[PDB]
Nucleic acid binder design. Structure first.
Ligand SMILES: Nc1ncnc2c1ncn2[C@@H]1O[C@H](COP(=O)(O)O)[C@@H](O)[C@H]1O
Ligand SMILES: Nc1ncnc2c1ncn2[C@@H]1O[C@H](COP(=O)(O)O)[C@@H](O)[C@H]1O
Ligand SMILES: N[C@@H](Cc1ccc(O)cc1)C(=O)O
Ligand SMILES: N[C@@H](Cc1ccc(O)cc1)C(=O)O
Ligand SMILES: [Mg+2]
Ligand SMILES: [Mg+2]
Lengths: 428, 428
RNA sequence: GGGCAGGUGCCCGAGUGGCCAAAGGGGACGGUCUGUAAAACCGUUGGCGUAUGCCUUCGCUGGUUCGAAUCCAGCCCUGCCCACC
RNA sequence: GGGCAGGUGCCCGAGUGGCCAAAGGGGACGGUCUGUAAAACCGUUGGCGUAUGCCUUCGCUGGUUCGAAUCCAGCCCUGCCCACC
């Protein structure tokens, strides 16, 4: 067990801000399970490692005995959180969010404990649909226009002449009322959620509730190296991606992001992180990719993604990435495939596509149209352009003839770029 | 009967703006009773001649066969229309507005026809209370922040650092939704209502309705000569004030307001108004005061407050105010009292106040405390100050001794200023 | 409700009758080099099976012109400015 | 959530330890003059029945001081600036 001070110190690790920090300490001394809120608007399906930053911290709360309330923003997602936005969000239907919501519920359990005393799922439509005009008037009366416009995206858009739809100013009051509805002790979020979390405190005060602690985590940067990991930016690693693909993507995280990936996605000690960085960028990537590929290949990540877990998998810490043959089978194969492809090899397991003979012309298929039929190129023009840039291979050889007519009398291995492969064959 | 063109020309008289004017002409050619909307938030009891400006125009619509829908803003009045406001309005309870609402319903009929085919009363709580959060989101999505802040009071307050409560930006959508609820063809208002009326058009378009014509009347200036007549400014003449008081107040309208009072409150022709102004300010006041004192002494004003009506009362147009002995008894007495008081006389009918002998000190009452007991002064200090300024009279003589101890062995006539009188006497 | 400007490619954004699948910057994509990284460098960034060609393309719908992303008109939406004060 | 400034009389607003029931402007109120108007001019704009006095008074609650509208602290609310990007 932990004392309240020990609890707070553990929870602080990796956090950007706990505010008011003294209030979390005081709540931790109450000797009761705290209600820890996280909302997520399912505007697109699937969770990624950026979501894992806040969810892993919530798992830490659960391992300390506190209760997570995961709010599916089926109602709020219809609106669109303008936080950080450069322009107004497109609306979605309640049915749209609830289809995406199914993935969130299924995937959240890959990180969160699911025992009821530690976890409860809510849909904010449960209470937001019945909120009446009079109540909305009284809620919005709690803040002024000048106060609302302080939020960075409102200030910048207004000063630049970029439209702000008035309904965007109602969204924070929905999120904040959610905290009243579930009597939140703590609200989790990335740093981008800071303003809405603070409105939560204001609305709770107005409803006579203790104002929640706002618990802010730093944002994981995406694979591009600059922007926050997000679905819209197509720079993300999904929690349910096959180990093969997760391992490859983690190996390609830009080197300057390694410390934050270790701090936000693992529990390694600071000296352990420095030790991996001493070994060098590639060894450090191998350990990161092994830890997380293994953890997310499990049905649920362990309570600690630490050195002990690493060795649990069969790896040796003092090998610093050299022991490639160790580990869970799924991870070992993923790393083996990564290295085989890196050296110019073709993996043995590659997707298969059968081409109907009705596509043949003079008994063959023009190479450009063949790659579009295989799903590797969006258009024949693009296939031609990739050939001009030496981006396509046929049975391992770089294509130099954009007019090549390909013989499919036997299966052929098509390759686009570094590691997209398809074997094509014919069928009547 | 009137043609649509004749109808529009009549309705234009006195109006500041009909917009789109061509749309009113087209509605008038439809050959059906148009729904003519007026909302009024009963934030204080009683209607005044400023309200009469818009209500008389509505009466004109009714006399042309169109249907008034008078909306009591029992719900909106709880919020507070920020239009023209220098600061945020104080909220009221639904019970508060509905007590004030009783006066509005009773007094509106002094101007409006009350036959159902010409008149229907609604309370906007009828439909606004059931408006749901989702619907409010969709309503507010119809306008942006920059669009909302164009309204003069929002722009000036925001640029000056004067707070605007966010709920003030919801009010126009309530007023506008009211137009959807009753399918308004026309919305009436003073010029101060222009922005909210135009939002009405936008919301009607979004609900697939023909957008209402916005019918704007100029604001009647109050007795102070500068500000719009309003209860808050204490510069108004109430529709139900006794003829005695209405006549006196109309005689004291500043001379530069006479043309607008004739144009907005009577139907006299422009050449008739000039003819009265030629007679001089006082004659012109006598005719104005007679016309309106008579009209509002009736249970309902006539369809035309014109020269024919004037002569109907027994006055002679070519006497230009000299025939003081003519007219309804109530008006003749009011004018007689006005002139008697002007020449320093005391009227025969004056309020009576009985003072209990328990107020006596050495068998008398200090003059200052006597005026406070009579209701003429708010405090003895103020009575003393008024004596120093020669503002109080006792039995017609100007009081010069602020220490006077008044003998009440017989009734005494107290006077404050020009025309506030009270007769005081004793009782055990 | 009135005026003016604007909406363009993955994003921002230039166009300023033809030189436009479209400047410049960013991004993304391919390659060299490697470490399936970065940087640097070169290239690509509507579609079409015979191409000196065909189809589609700058908010929507039309119009003038041999030719419109560009000019005109109606309409939608936005910003600024009016109106309201 | 952090900082700074602010809330004063009917309104705006000055105060800058005592000279404060409180500058200045507006408004309102009384009077002269009249037209029960305006303008101009003079005056008034916390309360109290013996006044060289008593009571209350500058967002709320306390505090320092002989004395606080003024200085200090906690709290409420606002504006600007942070945070968020
Ligand atoms: N890349 C990220 N790093 C850390 N937290 C994130 C990231 N992306 C989303 N979140 C958090 O996950 C929640 C849902 O975010 P979103 O998916 O953007 O609606 C919010 O609390 C976010 O701050
Ligand atoms: N002095 C006035 N002159 C003309 N119309 C007025 C006046 N006062 C109020 N109204 C109109 O009466 C309606 C209610 O106004 P209010 O009493 O200010 O809530 C609105 O349409 C106003 O424009
Ligand atoms: N605003 C959060 C979602 C959310 C929804 C409801 C809440 O109560 C809290 C958060 C997001 O952008 O994903
Ligand atoms: N806004 C109007 C009242 C009103 C209420 C409802 C309406 O639908 C229209 C007008 C006022 O200030 O008095
Ligand atoms: Mg406009
Ligand atoms: Mg703040």
């Amino acid at each position: 067990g932990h004392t309240p001070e020990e609890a707070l110190a553990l929870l602080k690790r990796g956090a950007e801000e706990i505010v008011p920090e003294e209030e979390l300490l005081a709540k931790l001394k109450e000797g009761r399970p705290l209600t820890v809120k996280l909302g997520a608007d399912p505007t697109r399906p699937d969770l990624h490692l950026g979501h894992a930053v806040v969810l892993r911290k919530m798992r830490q709360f659960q391992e300390l005995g506190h209760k997570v309330v995961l709010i599916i923003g089926d109602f709020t997602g219809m609106i669109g959180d303008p936080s950080g936005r450069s322009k107004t969000r497109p609306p979605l239907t309640l049915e749209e969010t609830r289809e995406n919501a199914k993935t969130y519920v299924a995937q959240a359990g890959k990180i969160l404990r699911q025992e009821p005393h530690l976890f409860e799922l809510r849909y904010n439509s449960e209470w937001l649909e019945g909120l009446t005009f009079k109540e909305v008037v009284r809620l919005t009366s709690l803040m002024t226009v000048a106060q609302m416009l302080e939020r960075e995206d409102f200030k910048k858009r207004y000063e630049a002449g970029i439209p702000i739809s008035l309904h965007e100013l109602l969204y924070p009051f929905a999120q904040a009322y959610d905290s009243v509805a579930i009597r939140a002790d703590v609200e989790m979020g990335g740093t981008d959620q800071r303003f809405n979390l603070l409105v939560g405190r204001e609305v709770q005060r107005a409803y006579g509730q203790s104002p929640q602690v706002c618990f802010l985590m730093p944002l994981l940067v995406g694979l591009d190296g600059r922007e926050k990991m997000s679905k819209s930016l197509d720079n993300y690693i999904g929690l349910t991606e096959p180990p093969e693909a997760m391992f490859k993507k983690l190996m390609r995280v830009p080197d300057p992001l390694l410390p934050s990936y270790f701090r936000l996605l693992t529990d390694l000690e600071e000296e352990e992180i420095e030790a991996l960085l001493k070994a060098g960028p590639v060894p450090a990537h191998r350990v990161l990719a092994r830890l997380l590929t293994a953890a997310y290949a499990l049905p649920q990540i362990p309570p600690r993604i630490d050195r002990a877990f690493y060795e649990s998998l069969g790896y040796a810490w003092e090998a610093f990435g050299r022991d490639k043959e160790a580990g869970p089978e799924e991870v070992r194969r993923a790393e083996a495939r990564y290295d085989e492809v890196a050296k110019g090899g073709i993996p043995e397991e590659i997707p298969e596509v059968t081409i109907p003979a009705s596509e043949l012309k003079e008994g063959r298929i023009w190479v450009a149209r063949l790659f579009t039929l295989a799903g590797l190129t969006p258009s024949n023009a693009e296939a031609r352009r990739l050939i001009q840039n030496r981006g396509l291979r046929l049975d391992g050889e770089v294509l130099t003839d954009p007019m090549l007519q390909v013989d499919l009398s036997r299966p052929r291995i098509l390759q686009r770029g570094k590691d997209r492969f398809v074997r094509v064959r014919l069928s009547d």
